[PDB]
């Protein structure tokens, strides 16, 4: 995640193993139950896309759901690209590039790039955009997996 250091700057720090394991354990115990979404939300505080793929990729089991989510993440990403067209002409030397759906999904962007966008002024909340897609896709799952 990207956290604020004592000095008063935003720097990246790694997520903790008993945080990781707590994510694992939630999924083990409460599967598709709604409490998973606030839980997720708390444990995703200050998290990167990269950390969010890590959390999704580290799941075991419920592979039908994991595929449905993936496909929702790509749909929501396809929709990001649709709604926000690429911008006019070449990229400025003085500036950094606008993200695509796949940069938001973490796929085409690097960590330093993910830190550029979030730490820069104005900052862009690429975590929160992926977060809604995850929560939206979580609703899809919850609604389906209701019996």
């Amino acid at each position: 995640p990207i956290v604020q250091n004592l000095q008063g700057q935003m720097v990246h720090q790694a997520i903790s193993p008993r945080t990781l394991n707590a994510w694992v354990k939630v999924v083990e115990e409460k599967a598709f139950s709604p409490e998973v979404i606030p839980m997720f939300s708390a444990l995703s505080e200050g998290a990167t896309p990269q950390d969010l793929n890590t959390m999704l990729n580290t799941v075991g089991g419920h592979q039908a759901a994991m595929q449905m989510l993936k496909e929702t993440i790509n749909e929501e990403a396809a929709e990001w690209d649709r709604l926000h067209p690429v911008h006019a002409g070449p990229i400025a030397p003085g500036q950094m590039r606008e993200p695509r759906g796949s940069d938001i999904a973490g796929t085409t962007s690097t960590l330093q790039e993910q830190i550029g966008w979030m730490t820069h002024n104005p900052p862009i909340p690429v975590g929160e955009i992926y977060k809604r897609w995850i929560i939206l896709g979580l609703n899809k799952i919850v609604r389906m997996y209701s019996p």
Partner: protein
């Protein structure tokens, strides 16, 4: 399971039924106004005759502690 399929048994305490209702209501994602409509309507409708009778005597304006204490002996 659908919210319409939630009903009170003939021997089931209301209490155990009301818990089931707001759990299933907890998995409904509808507007609050619709969920208010569901609350005043469906809960009583699928309640058992003995308690149903009881709840009709509370009239309208009733709140959950009073409903829950009202159908306790049933």
């Amino acid at each position: 399971t659908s919210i319409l399929d939630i009903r009170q048994g003939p021997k089931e305490p209301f209490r155990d039924y009301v818990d089931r209702f707001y759990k299933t209501l907890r998995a409904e994602q509808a507007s609050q106004e619709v969920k208010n409509w569901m609350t005043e309507t469906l809960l009583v409708q699928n309640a058992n005759p003995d308690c149903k009778t009881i709840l009709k005597a509370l009239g309208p304006g009733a709140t959950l502690e009073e409903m829950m204490t009202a159908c306790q002996g049933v």
